[PDB]
């Protein structure tokens, strides 16, 4: 469990992320797709994108980046009390989208990388540690739901 001090570090940088959700969403999805190409295959709507330039020019990709970050922000602001927000997500990602937990680990790495490049002053080692812990909590909770449903993997 994250301490009150750790949540403060997480939410402080997230407030900055909310200043430009669309730009952040783009950077994160593009990093995910370039670093782990297999993740792009899960998206019928993005499968046609072959270069970073094409990804950067896609308004649909930008719009969906807002979708991911808005859902994640709703979860982070619950400070661990995210049962109602996480349930629907785990259900859809395990049974409909078929996203293995490993991919959630990949997107967490992308999020951390982007926050570091855009918010150095508010994302030192202490904040990086807190953010990693918050993302691991998210993954641990999703993992349990996956196991219940028979998708642990
Ligand atoms: C922090 C991580 C994530 C969050 C908060 C998140 C959130 C969402 C949300 C809110 C939707 C909308 C409704 C729904 O279908 O449940 C969605 C759809 C989807 N997500 Fe994610 N997601 C995450 C990670 C991922 C990852 C890592 C992948 C794939 C590697 C993925 C693949 C999908 C797909 C395939 C859809 C549907 C796309 C479509 O409608 O065409 N998600 N996600």
Residue nearest to atom 15 of ligand 1 (CA): 92
Cα of 69 from ligand 1 centre, angstroms: 10
Establish whether 24 is an annotated binding residue.
no
Tokens 């009390």 map to which residue? 81
- This structure's resolution (Å) is 1.7
Cα of 42 from ligand 1 centre, angstroms: 10
Fold of the domain spanning 1-153: Globin-like (1.10.490)
C-alpha–C-alpha distance, residues 132 and 148, integer Å: 25
Which residue among 71, 72, 84, 98 has the greatest number of ligand 1 atoms within 8 angstroms of its CB, and so is best to mutate?
71
The residues near 27 (Cβ < 8 Å, ≥ 6 apart) are 114, 117, 118
Exposure string (b/e) for 119-141, b if CB count within 10 Å is 16 or more? Answer: beeebeeebeebbebbbebbbeb
Question: What are the residue ranges spanned by the domains of the chain?
Answer: 1-153
Q: Which DSSP string do the residues of 51-85 spell out, in sequence order? A: SHHHHHH-HHHHHHHHHHHHHHHHHHTTTT--HHH
Sign of the four-CA dihedral 3, 113, 55, 16: positive
Cα of 13 from ligand 1 centre, angstroms: 22
The residues near 42 (Cβ < 8 Å, ≥ 6 apart) are 97, 98, 99, 103
C-alpha–C-alpha distance, residues 85 and 64, integer Å: 18
PDB experimental method = X-ray
């Amino acid at each position: 469990v994250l301490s009150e001090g750790e949540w403060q570090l997480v939410l402080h940088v997230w407030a900055k992320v909310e200043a430009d959700v669309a730009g952040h969403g783009q950077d994160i999805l593009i990093r995910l797709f370039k670093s782990h190409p297999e993740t792009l295959e899960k998206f019928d709507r993005f499968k046609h994108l072959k270069t970073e330039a094409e990804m950067k020019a896609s308004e649909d990709l930008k719009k969906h980046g807002v979708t991911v970050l808005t859902a994640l922000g709703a979860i982070l602001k619950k400070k661990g009390h995210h049962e109602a927000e996480l349930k629907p997500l785990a259900q859809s990602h395990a049974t409909k989208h078929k996203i293995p937990i490993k991919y959630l680990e990949f997107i967490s790495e992308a999020i951390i990388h982007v926050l570091h490049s855009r918010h150095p002053g508010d994302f030192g080692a202490d904040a990086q540690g807190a953010m990693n812990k918050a993302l691991e909590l998210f993954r641990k909770d999703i993992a349990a739901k996956y196991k219940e449903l028979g998708y642990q993997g």
